[PDB]
Structure formats: C-alpha cells, structure tokens
Structure prediction request, 619 residues.
Amino acid sequence: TLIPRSVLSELDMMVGKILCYLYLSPERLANQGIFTSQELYEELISLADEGKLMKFVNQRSSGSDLDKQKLQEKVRTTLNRLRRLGMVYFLPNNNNKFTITEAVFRFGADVRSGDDPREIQLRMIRDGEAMPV
Amino acid sequence: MSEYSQTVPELVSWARKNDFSISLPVERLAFLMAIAVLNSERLDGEMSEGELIDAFREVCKGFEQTAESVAVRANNAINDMVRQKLLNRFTSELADGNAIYRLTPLGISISDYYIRQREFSTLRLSMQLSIVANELHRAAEAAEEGGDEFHWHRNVFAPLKYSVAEIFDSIDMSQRLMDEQQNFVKEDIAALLNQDWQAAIANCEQLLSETSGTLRELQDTLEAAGDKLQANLLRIQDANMGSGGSELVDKLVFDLQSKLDRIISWGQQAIDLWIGYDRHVHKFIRTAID
Amino acid sequence: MSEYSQTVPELVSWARKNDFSISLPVERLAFLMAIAVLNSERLDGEMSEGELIDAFREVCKGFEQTAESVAVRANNAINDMVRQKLLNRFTSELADGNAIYRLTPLGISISDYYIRQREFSTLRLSMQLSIVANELHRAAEAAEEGG
Amino acid sequence: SELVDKLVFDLQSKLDRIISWGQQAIDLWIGYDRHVHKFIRTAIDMDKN
Prediction:
C-alpha cells in the first residue's frame, strides 16, 4: 500500500462485538436505535468476564469502584474513537445517548459462516482483513 | 464423621491447590482493626467504599505516611483484604454500581483477637458450666423418655451438637486464653527480676500465689462440675444403647466425653506446669540471694 | 464500657507501638492447619516439638520440598508461630527439657475457618434462638423480682 | 445500673443488626436472581431462527 494501515485495540473489539449484538437485539429495537453508555456497559459486563477484563484497565484491579469508573471512562474514550470511524452517531444535543449503523457488522467477520474458527481466521489474515496480536 | 474429614496430606494438597495465604503487616492489621471498630459503631453492619477509604486515611495519618496516592493505596489494601477473604463485597445493579462491604468470619476472628480484651473469668466459666449442665440434663431426660428418630434428632442430637459442643469449645478457648495470661505473667516475672530482683521478690511471690490460686479455683470448679456432666453424658449413652443406638449420637457423645476429658486434664496439666515454673523461680531467687 | 475501649487513632497508635503482624504464606498456613488436625485427634490437646517437626515434614512433602534442613526450617517455623502468637510454648523442667506446645485462640480461629466445614443450619439458628429466649426470659424475671 | 443499661442497649443494637441483615441479603439476592432470569430469557427466547 501507498497509504499506511493500522489495527484496532482489543478493547475496541470488545466494544465492537457488543455494539454488533446490540444492533441485532430485537428486544431493544423499540428504542428506535437510541442507546445509552450505561446500557452498553451493562450488556458488556453481563457477557464478558468482568474481573478478568479489568486486567486491561489496570494490572492490580480487583473490583474497586475507582477502577470500575476508570473502565467506564476508557469505554467512553474508545466509543468516541468508533464515532470518528463512522460506526456510531451521537445525538445532536445529548452526548450520553447515541445510534448504531450497520458498519458494526465487520466485528462479526470471524463467525458469519458456521465453520472451523481456525480456517476462518487464516482466510481473514490472507485477505488482509485482520491481524493477530 | 470427624468434624475434620480430611487427612493431613489431603488438607495440605487442598491448601496448596487453593493458594490460601495471609499477609497482614502492621499497617494492614491496623486497618483491619479500624474497620472492625467502625463496623461495631454502625446500625446496619455495612460499610461503603468511601467510608473504608476514610478509615485507611486515618491509619496512614497515624503511621505519618505521605498523602500521595492514598486513594490508590486504600484500593490496593481493600482489594488485598477481599483477596485474603477478610471482606465480602456486594455489587448490586440496584445500588448504581456502589459496592457494599461486610467483614468475613475470619476477618472478625483476627480483629477481635487483638481488640477484644478477653480476660479469663471464673464467673464466665461458672455460667457456661451452669448452662451446659442444664442443657445436658434436658438432653439426658429426653434420651431417657425415649422416642422415634425425629425425637432423638431434635431433642438429643441437636442440643448436643449445636449447644453443648459450642459451649465446650468456648470453655476450651477460655483455657487457651488462660495459657496466654500465664505466659504474660511469666514475662512480667522475668522483667521484675531483671530490673530490681531484691524489690521484685515480694511482687513475684504474690503473682505466683495469685496465678496458682486462680488455676486451683478453676480446676476445682471444673472437677466439681465435670462429674455431673460426665454422669449426664453416660445417662445419654446408656439411653442410646437401650433405644437401638444411633451411631451418630454415640460418636457425638464420645467426642463430647473426649473434649470434657481434655478440658479436665488441661487444668491439672496447667497446675503442674505452673508448679514447675514456681519451683524454678524460687530456685533462681535462692541462687541469686545466695 | 464499649467492648472496644479505644478510639481509631488510639488503636492505631497502640498497634504501631506494639508492632503486631501476621505473616502466613501458603506453607506456614498449611502447617498451622496440620497442627490443628493433629491436635483435635489427641486426648491431651498438647504437642511435643518432635511431633511438630514431623507435622512440618509431612507439610514439606506436600509442598514437594527437599528433605534437607527440615529440622532447621521446622524450628524456624515453630519460633515464627510462637512470635506471631499462634502457638504457646511451655518449657517445663519436669518434662525432661522437652517443650510443650498448645495452639492459641488466634491459631484455632484461623485454622478452624479453613478446615471446619461450616454450613448454615436453620436447626442451629432455631436452637440458638430457643436458648437465648430462655436466658433472656430468666434474666427478665430476675430483673422484675428485683434485688 | 449504668452497666446493665449499656449492656441491654448494646444487645438491642446487635439484635436490630441481625434482623436488618436478612432483609438486605434478600434484596441483593433478588436483584441478581432477576438479572440472571432476564439474561437467560434474552439468550433463549429472543433469537428465533
């Protein structure tokens, strides 16, 4: 390439795959696409390993509220980066609420076909879609 | 089935697999004690994260430590206490993410050992012996009245297991406290003899006589009550043997008899050890005077 | 008199002055629990130094540690447990120079918390409430009788 | 007797704490129970294909 290429962080992926599940969820379709940072955070902690994920915020985290607020602020920051990428749009007057777009489906590129995960991953790296860490 | 179902090798393997460890340096121990005191002054037995941080700040101030990173240090200390099983943390969605803290049975036992001024009381022992004598008498009467497995489980096994066994454990703990008090008197006698031995002879003789008198009063109280307690345990054993014989009641009565024999034997052994030390101190005083 | 006669600053100053500390790594904690199990199987509630060294040898085997210097390590562990107020050491001339060891209330509380399988029992609670109700009722009758 | 009054007050305070703890534990357990049931229902029933 004549133009530089870069990769997203693993926290960005966690927020990306969660935003993807949120888009699909018919249970929340009644919101008309408007979600709140707190709802996103609540869904994320419901699915992923909370205490093990906390390791990325700080190597000494053990469930303290200061560390929980630090995690929430990192989420707030990464979500803002995804907005610049065009993956989510904030409301015109309220920044605690936002709307999703279909571009988030790229986070599901590792599972859209019901096949061997290793082979899928190999195919993706071969196509230049994704790198390991 | 032995209260401790695990052999020493099974227990050591279990402890190693679970990675259990306790590391409470002076600052961490002071913080645990401050938390225990703050919890005792409250109406709900619950502490918030901010209140724990304020308590840690007071400990850091008492240790004249730098006010830098105190919030981080307090979080590390709180996480360490939770990680060492001294505090239980409750994270409720209803509490908007605010965690509620309560001390564990372990954290309370360690903090109470240092903060609770436990003195051996002949009155406490006499009361505990009076309650257990009444409980054993009621269990013996119920055992002699006879009945079904439900009568024996509710009126004989439950009182022996959940009341008599706990009071015997409390008496044993009081005896262990007396063991510590004797070691404290020994340190005081060694200190009085190291400062001014000539002026300390009268004080040492008084401490030796008073400790001997207390041990004798305790042993006399235990011997006087011990026979009545052993008679009631034998009444229950005879009644159990006559009404088929629950192996669970027999094992429990045997454990209680063994604990009672240990409680009675401890008093005689403590008196013998104290007599040996008394003779040693008098020999030392005679050698120093000569 | 509040069971805890000292304010937090007084307690902190008192703790700092007496230099109280507990250091129980996994091996020392396992040694304490081993001593508690061995003591509960005995008729005299007393342990000799040789029995403590053997108990420590059994723990060292469980930690897959070398049998070299086990006696020195055992003596250091025993001295450390005595220094941390987990074991009371009695040296009687009558015991032919042999030291007797007994677990302290602290050593028993710590060992029981991990080894005693304490499960909540509704029957236990109902019994405890029955005893306290009778004790409070007698105390109330005695208070009303006056004296 | 100031000693008996203080002791009775302490025991009453302990009894209130003992009674209050049970209701609080039930509320915390209910919050979790509702959350796990909601999660299971969302996981099971809302994906239909």
Q: What stands out?
A: The CA atoms of residues 39 and 45 of chain C lie 5 Å apart.
